[model samples]
Target: QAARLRRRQLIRQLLERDKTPLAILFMAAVVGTLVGLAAVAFDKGVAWLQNQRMGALVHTADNYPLLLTVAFLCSAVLAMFGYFLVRKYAPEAGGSGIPEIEGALEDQRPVRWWRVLPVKFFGGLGTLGGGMVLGREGPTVQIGGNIGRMVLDIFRLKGDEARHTLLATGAAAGLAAAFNAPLAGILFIIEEMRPQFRYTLISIKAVFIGVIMSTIMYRIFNHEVALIDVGKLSDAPLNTLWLYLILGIIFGIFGPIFNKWVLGMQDLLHRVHGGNITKWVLMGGAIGGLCGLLGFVAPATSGGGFNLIPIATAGNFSMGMLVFIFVARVITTLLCFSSGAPGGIFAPMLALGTVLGTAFGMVAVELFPQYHLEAGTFAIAGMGALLAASIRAPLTGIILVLEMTDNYQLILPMIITGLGATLLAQFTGGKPLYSAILARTLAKQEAEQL
Candidate 1:
């Protein structure tokens, strides 16, 4: 009874501080483990769905027309299911959910975990399974944030600071689990979500602990293979480093145009759908079904594009073919993501950077054959450039690619490319993508309330 009194006193003392309460740190551990499991489950779920859809067509390879129709219908129906769920259950679960989490952290949005946790998990399965060009990272991060709120509500934690700390911790944990890159995950919160996050020592400690737990859980299942299997490539010579700067400038220009296209397409999608559930879902189904058809026509341009990264970086495609695929994939990316299909643009953006970077490297090689350039090095450098430029999070972009590809030697060039893209993107008036999306969401909310 005396020991219990001491424990209660300690808890009371910890809870009185403005920093992260001791209880919140323990809750972070719980949230991280749960979020990590959800991340792995999401990955496996998408893989299983992909296999089921693609497996059906494996034996029917000989019959082109029938196989094509079946694939299209299967993917379309799957995508429709996802759209219907998001539309009917939780509209906030739609699109890349990172911005919504940002809003939640700032107390501008509600964290409806009960609805979001299940909808994003299953809705993501449908959209991703349908072979639409999207990434898993966004949904995982949003789900993790939701999980954090769920824990807070379940435990009846009522402090404002505690709520904020756990939400950020869970977001970081989810990102770490998605890529198994704890450092990048930490930096993502510090850099990308800096405006919303409080940087107290206790809060940072909570983030660190959360990421550590999530990463450990991630490794248990993933077994530690580099997410992108581009074995260590050659380093860039000092003399050829300027080429990376040039590539960054190109991406700087490309970044704003890319953002404009995404926003424009988003506006177009909203206009066409006009908040009608039936039209919205059917349009999403049509876009998803078309992507499925593209899966047959050009498999590289469909899906999340992770598999296409190494192939594009290895100098496999001719310059002309690389450009063609880049343009084609960009169109597909904008179409699929802007249509509110509950997917991420992260991996697809990386794939775009790789194709463009590889093309630039090939051209540089031709220009200065004496330098004997390795296109893969430029591919590595440029891999994170678009993300840096578009998201305006150069540190996160650089560290994420470095961690994903295990390419420490190319850090200098990667930094140069990332900074160049970021600087030029700023100069050219390109707003950060997530912030832009969040602003739009807020505007909609205000208008509706008015």
Candidate 2:
């Protein structure tokens, strides 16, 4: 009888000591599923709004002047709606929300899921629908993080570690669902959120489970397809690999400048708006309207930049055109993102890297015809290079590009490029973009409280 009782006691102890309790796993599943649905809904909402305003007008190309004016007005209204929603209800929903999530993970920021979820969803629809240069992944990540907090609050989960684990799980799940890159999602937490997320076996398992659930749910609504469809390209030759390293160096130079321009633009916006809600919304409207105008003039330089990726990789544009679009989109990205629109800079940054990389490849092709290299490989490498320079998460950037493009053969070049960029950026004393943004946010929070 005593042995049986001792066996029961051991079973109880095992259950009690399990770091990843059944309840925590269950909550992770719930968070993942909810975040996945939320991401899909956000995507659909943006698509529907775009179709309503711009897609319907595609057939009316004959009326150029009228079309431009109508497009501008429609985009302006949509963007203004986003600005209004964000300024009035939840200011934290503005911009790429990754920093906010990072802040929340460290307990330096508040979740306010009730406000953020609705605000980010609807606000993202407005800004993204307005054809601004932004990505959906950032808002989706923010939504997932908030959802995690919501689950915790609802389930009455206590302990800072428990909260942090679920928060990281949801954020990673959101990224997985957003891009259909499950491994990238997991690595993002490990690499990007390493400072904030507690690294435990149970926490890692929760992240894995959340990403799996979210990815499965995402695949159900959106079929499995590469986010950026660059058909299989020739493997980057080791001899030509040195060129990728140069490209990475160039991005390292550009990354800090790009970040500065972004912050400068943000400062300009703050000066213009002066914290006035009406002025802020109007500024956002003007920026969105300009993006709409650009959509007609230089379609390659507007919106989220996804549609341009495949075309750019296919080498359809001349070098001059590529440079032109690159410069134009860089300006638009800064304008739109700095205007405090509820969107992400990731896709826009990718687009920038592609155009620049392709341009470099074309030059290399002229300089050395013997290599018979494909510009597409450079485009892929550059995609992650700039991300490495900007975010200082080389592994995450490399793995993310590989996952998105499924170009396993290019992995070595990708690593080389990513590493080069990261090293140069570090050597040049450039701060990491997300960390800088988070620091800025924390400073603002303190200032406001004071």
Instruction: Please list the C-alpha lDDT of all candidates, in the order they appear.
Output: 0.88, 0.84
Q: Which ten residues in a row have the lowest lDDT in candidate 2?
A: 193-202
**Candidate 2 structure quality by residue, lDDT tens digits, 317-379:** 898788889889888888898878888777888888888888887887779889997777788
TM-score of 2: 0.93
Clash pairs of candidate 1? none
Q: What's the TM-score of every candidate structure?
A: 0.94, 0.93
* Cand. 1 TM to true fold: 0.94
C-alpha lDDT (0 to 100) for residue 273 of candidate 2 = 68
Candidate 2, position 75, lDDT:
87
RMSD to true structure for each model, in Å: 5.8, 4.9
Q: Write the per-residue lDDT of candidate 1 for residues 1-450, one digit (tens) a residue.
A: 468988889999888765656788899899889988888888888889889987897867888899889989989999999999999999999989888988887778899999998899998889998899999888888898899898999999988778888888898898898877899888998888756444533288889889999988888887856578887788888888888899999999999999999989999888987999999999999999999998867888888888888787765798778988898899999999999888878889999999898998888878998888887888989999999999888999999998888889889999999989999999999999999999999998999989
The list of candidate 2 runs beyond 4 A from truth reads 1-18, 59-62, 196-202, 224-226
